[PDB]
A = this chain, B = another copy of it.
């Protein structure tokens, strides 16, 4: 009975982290019922249905095409539809050639053509372009050519089979797409947008928490978590952003998201944020070591380091708010100029020769932190310019 407890608790947490999952679990059932209902109560023209498997194929298309996002279902349905169309054409042509050839060489020719085409398509499925965008199209191309060839039917029977398969794929796909767009849309573009903004926010949190924690049993573990987990999640999220970018490319335009929305720039800014995460990770690893410098030697540089960290955090926070609000912002300029000024002041403080009296190992550690922080500052400057460019060339509301 205990595993029943564990599975129901896992269900509870998965549902509570996200409700759109439950609403999608209901949307799939609604699509199935709508499609199935369509066949039982023939709406306007009782379709011929020569083979007796139209309903089977409609339900199969609906179960396979319907995915979480809107870009996912639109892409899967469009690949499946276009591949079925072209491959049905090619299959009818191959069957006509097979018939025209002769009597006994017909199975030989059909099997040879299936071989050649499946081989060429399986090879093409390895290209990078195809692998990222139209993969599921080519699996269906092979499926359909092999269906219309290797299934033993006669000529007119083959023409009817191809038409039936195409019409059923179109109906299943359109039903899936309409219910996914019009009931409770999960746009992948907005999921990518929110993920980018959330990443910005976690980085700001760490920068402020560092400015505080650097110069100072259970609460130790909680603060260790509140430091580690956030940037450590930014680090391990390359594939999620890369996938949401494709899905978002597939989508139609909707509110505040115009026709040419640059998702590749979103992924570029994500890459810059990942570099910041590398540096922040080095900083954190130097926080959680045992060999820590005595406090006052850090406090002798406590002023500019605290100023630098705080201003970087505030600049990142303003960029996150400017992305959540979908408006061009110009506070990041002030918040990054302050950090450049703090870098210059730290430079002229180091020039004055204050660290001349400390043992050089403490110098190792202290200049390590100073170097990582200066690199973080330069990186936030670059990120500020890049986000400004994205917001310009994605047509944000110039109101500010």
Residues of A within 8 A of B (CB): 10-11, 14-15, 21-22, 24-26, 28-30, 32-33, 36-37, 40, 53, 55-56, 59-60, 63-64, 107, 111, 114-116, 118-120, 122-123, 126-129, 139, 142-143, 146-147, 150-152, 236, 238-239, 278-279, 281-282, 285, 347, 350-351, 353, 355-356, 359-361, 363-365, 367-368, 370-372, 374-375
Task: With CB as the reference atom, state the residue of chain B lying closest to A28.
Answer: B122
- Count the copies: 2
Within the complex, the shortest CB–CB distance from A315 to chain B, in Å, comes to 21
Q: Are A25 and B123 in contact (CB under 8 A)?
A: yes
Q: Count chain B CB atoms within 10 A of each CB in A30, A107, A150, A368 and give the residue with the most.
A: A150
Interface CB pairs A-B, < 8 A, 28: A10-B129, A14-B126, A28-B119, A29-B114, A29-B122, A30-B115, A33-B111, A36-B111, A40-B152, A53-B151, A55-B151, A55-B152, A56-B147, A56-B151, A59-B151, A60-B143, A63-B142, A64-B143, A239-B239, A279-B282, A282-B282, A351-B361, A355-B360, A356-B356, A363-B367, A364-B371, A368-B368, A368-B371
> Please, how many angstroms separate the alpha-carbon atoms of A341 and B127 in the complex?
49
> Please, how many angstroms separate the alpha-carbon atoms of A215 and B281 in the complex?
27
Q: Are A139 and B64 in contact (CB under 8 A)?
A: yes
Q: Are A360 and B351 in contact (CB under 8 A)?
A: yes
Residues of B within 8 A of A367 (CB): 360, 363-364, 367-368, 371
Residues of B within 8 A of A15 (CB): 123
CB within 8 Å for A353 and B360 given contacts A63-B142, A139-B64, A150-B36? yes
Q: Are A361 and B347 in contact (CB under 8 A)?
A: yes
> Please, how many angstroms separate the alpha-carbon atoms of A343 and B37 in the complex?
75
CB within 8 Å for A63 and B139 given contacts A114-B33, A360-B350, A361-B347? yes
Q: Are B143 and A63 in contact (CB under 8 A)?
A: yes
Residues of B within 8 A of A347 (CB): 361
Residues of B within 8 A of A26 (CB): 119
CB within 8 Å for A123 and B22 given contacts A350-B360, A360-B350? yes
Task: With CB as the reference atom, state the residue of chain B lying closest to A35.
Answer: B150
CB within 8 Å for A375 and B60 given contacts A32-B115, A118-B32? no
